Structure 1
Amino acid sequence: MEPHSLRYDFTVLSWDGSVQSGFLTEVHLDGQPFIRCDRQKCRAWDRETRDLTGNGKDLRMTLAHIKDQKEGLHSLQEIRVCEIHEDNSTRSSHHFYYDGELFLSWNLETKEFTMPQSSRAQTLAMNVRNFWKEDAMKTKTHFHAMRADCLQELRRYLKSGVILRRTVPPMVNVTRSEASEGNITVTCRASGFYPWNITLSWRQDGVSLSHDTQQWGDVLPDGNGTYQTWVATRICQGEEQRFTCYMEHSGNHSTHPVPS
Structure 2
Amino acid sequence: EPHSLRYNLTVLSWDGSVQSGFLTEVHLDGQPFLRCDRQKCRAKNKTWDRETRDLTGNGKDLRMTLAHIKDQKEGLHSLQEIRVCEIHEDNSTRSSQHFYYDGELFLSQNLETKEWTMPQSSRAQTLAMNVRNFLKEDAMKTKTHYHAMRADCLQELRRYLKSGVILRRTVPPMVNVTRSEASEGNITVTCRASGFYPWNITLSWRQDGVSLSHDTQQWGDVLPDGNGTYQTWVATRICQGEEQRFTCYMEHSGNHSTHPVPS
TM-score, length-scaled by structure 1: 0.96
C-alpha displacement of 1:113? 1.8
**Per-residue CA distance 1:75-131 (angstroms, 9 max, x = gap):** 100000111122222111110000001111112354232111111100001011112
Residue pair 2:178, 2:261 contacting (<8 A) in 1 also: yes
- What is residue 38 of structure 1 aligned with on the other side? 37
Pick closer, same or farther for the CA change 1:137–1:55 going to 2, 3 Å: farther
The separation in 2 between residues aligned to 1:39 and 1:101, in whole angstroms, is: 24
The separation in 2 between residues aligned to 1:154 and 1:109, in whole angstroms, is: 16
The separation in 1 between residues aligned to 2:239 and 2:62, in whole angstroms, is: 66
Instruction: Select which of 113, 116, 122 maps to 2:116.
Output: 113
C-alpha displacement of 1:137? 3.8
The separation in 2 between residues aligned to 1:36 and 1:137, in whole angstroms, is: 29
Q: Note the residue ranges of structure 2 that are not aligned, 5 or more in a row.
A: none
**Per-residue CA distance 1:41-94 (angstroms, 9 max, x = gap):** 222233122232110100000000000131000110000011112222211111
What percentage of aligned pairs have identical amino acids? 97
Residue pair 1:75, 1:98 contacting (<8 A) in 2 also: yes
Pick closer, same or farther for the CA change 1:139–1:96 going to 2, 3 Å: farther
C-alpha displacement of 1:25? 2.1
The separation in 2 between residues aligned to 1:208 and 1:167, in whole angstroms, is: 26
**Per-residue CA distance 1:18-58 (angstroms, 9 max, x = gap):** 00000112221122222211114222233122232110100
C-alpha displacement of 1:10? 1.1
The separation in 2 between residues aligned to 1:109 and 1:170, in whole angstroms, is: 38
Residue pair 1:25, 1:53 contacting (<8 A) in 2 also: no
Q: How many residues align?
A: 259
C-alpha displacement of 1:141? 1.5
Residue pair 1:25, 1:36 contacting (<8 A) in 2 also: yes
Structure 1 position 224 matched with structure 2 position 227: yes
Residue pair 2:94, 2:112 contacting (<8 A) in 1 also: no
Residue pair 2:118, 2:125 contacting (<8 A) in 1 also: yes
Q: Note the residue ranges of structure 1 that are not aligned, 5 or more in a row.
A: none
SS at match of 1:21: coil
The separation in 2 between residues aligned to 1:215 and 1:254, in whole angstroms, is: 20
The separation in 2 between residues aligned to 1:225 and 1:138, in whole angstroms, is: 41
- What is residue 70 of structure 1 aligned with on the other side? 73
- What is residue 61 of structure 2 aligned with on the other side? 58
**Per-residue CA distance 1:182-214 (angstroms, 9 max, x = gap):** 000000000011111111000000000000000
The separation in 2 between residues aligned to 1:182 and 1:110, in whole angstroms, is: 64
Root mean square deviation, CA, Å: 1.2
> Which stretch of the first structure deviates more once superposed, 203-212 or 104-113?
104-113
> Which stretch of the first structure deviates more once superposed, 57-66 or 160-169?
160-169
Residue pair 1:176, 1:186 contacting (<8 A) in 2 also: yes
Pick closer, same or farther for the CA change 1:231–1:253 going to 2, 3 Å: same
**Per-residue CA distance 1:110-164 (angstroms, 9 max, x = gap):** 4232111111100001011112222144332111111101111111111121011
**Per-residue CA distance 1:190-243 (angstroms, 9 max, x = gap):** 001111111100000000000000000110010011010000000000100100
The separation in 1 between residues aligned to 2:209 and 2:143, in whole angstroms, is: 58
Structure 1 position 238 matched with structure 2 position 241: yes
The separation in 2 between residues aligned to 1:137 and 1:5, in whole angstroms, is: 29
Pick closer, same or farther for the CA change 1:110–1:34 going to 2, 3 Å: closer
TM-score, length-scaled by structure 2: 0.95
